[PDB]
Amino acid sequence: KGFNMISIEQEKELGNKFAVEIEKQQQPVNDPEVQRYVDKVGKRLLSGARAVEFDYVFKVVKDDSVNAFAIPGGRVYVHTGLLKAADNETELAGVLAHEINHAVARHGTRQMTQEYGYSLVLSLVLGDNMLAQLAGQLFGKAGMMSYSREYENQADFLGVETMYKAGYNPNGLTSFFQKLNATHPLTSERIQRVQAEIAKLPPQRYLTDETEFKKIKGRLKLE
């Protein structure tokens, strides 16, 4: 169960390599305004996180599927489809806060190390074509990085805290899920755990300025 973990510095390098490989199959958004907006919400959430140990980069990708995913080394990809599906900035932030916390807790590199072993992960770091196999399998359009129940719970727990500290209503993620119904599996357990975490916080009115969100969403539906 225990394993040798690569260093923060080594993971920065792993992320660099994954990023360039993953991006070969993506169509980027090259819209400074959309870029600026996602950067802002991401930066705001990071101010609420427990540890910011990477220079986080938020990349918006042209893809109608509803997804966001962190890769090793603090790089978070956000699909245009997610931005278009979100009803408000709070929903968007809820999804982003969960993914940021997978990065904060180093879940990607932990899961890869438990699955493949330290030697393989270290070899990715050093670049010993294996890196290309893994990019596709973990992070491509049919690719499932899949996190243990424990890591999902951690990302949920931290995401509620992150949202709260950043001044967003922590119900954002579950609200997004409800709207969607009207691989990060939203199980009975996760709903119960998230509701309990939210229940422990002081009741308060969450203030939002949806100006920028509505502008950006508007621009994306034009594409």
Q: Of 123 and 154, which has the nearer Cβ to Zn ion?
A: 154
Q: Which run of H or E residues covers position 69?
A: strand 68-71
Residue 28 β-bridge partners = 61
Cβ-contact 78, 38 below 8 angstroms: yes
CB of 200 to Zn ion, least distance (A): 21
Angle formed by the axes of helices 211-221 and 89-104, to 10°? 90
Pick the stretch among 32-40, 84-92, 177-185, 206-214 that binds Zn ion (CB under 5 A): 177-185
- Interface with Zn ion (CB under 5 A), residue total 3
Tokens matching residue 178:
């409800």
Pick the stretch among 23-31, 75-83, 144-152, 209-217 that binds Zn ion (CB under 5 A): 144-152
Among 79, 184, 190, 217, binds Zn ion (CB under 5 A): 184
Q: Of 12 and 102, which has the nearer Cβ to Zn ion?
A: 102
Asked whether residue 107 is marked as a ligand-binding residue, the answer is: no
Residue with tokens 């980027």: 28
Whole-angstrom CA distances from 110 to 7, 70, 150 are 11, 13, 12
Pick the stretch among 29-37, 127-135, 136-144, 180-188 that binds Zn ion (CB under 5 A): 180-188
What distance in Å separates the CA atoms of residue 24 and residue 22, rounded to the nearest whole number? 5
CB of 94 to Zn ion, least distance (A): 12
Site for Zn ion in 19-78 (CB under 5 A): none
Asked whether residue 98 is marked as a ligand-binding residue, the answer is: yes
Chain centroid to CA 36? 17
Per CB under 5 A, does 82 bind Zn ion?
no
Per CB under 5 A, does 155 bind Zn ion?
yes
What is the side-by-side strand order in the sheet with 57-61? 57-61, 75-79, 68-71
List residues binding Zn ion (CB under 5 A): 152, 155, 184
Query: Residue ranges for the binding site for Zn(2+)?
Result: 98, 102, 152, 184
Query: Residue ranges for the binding site?
Result: 98, 102, 152, 184
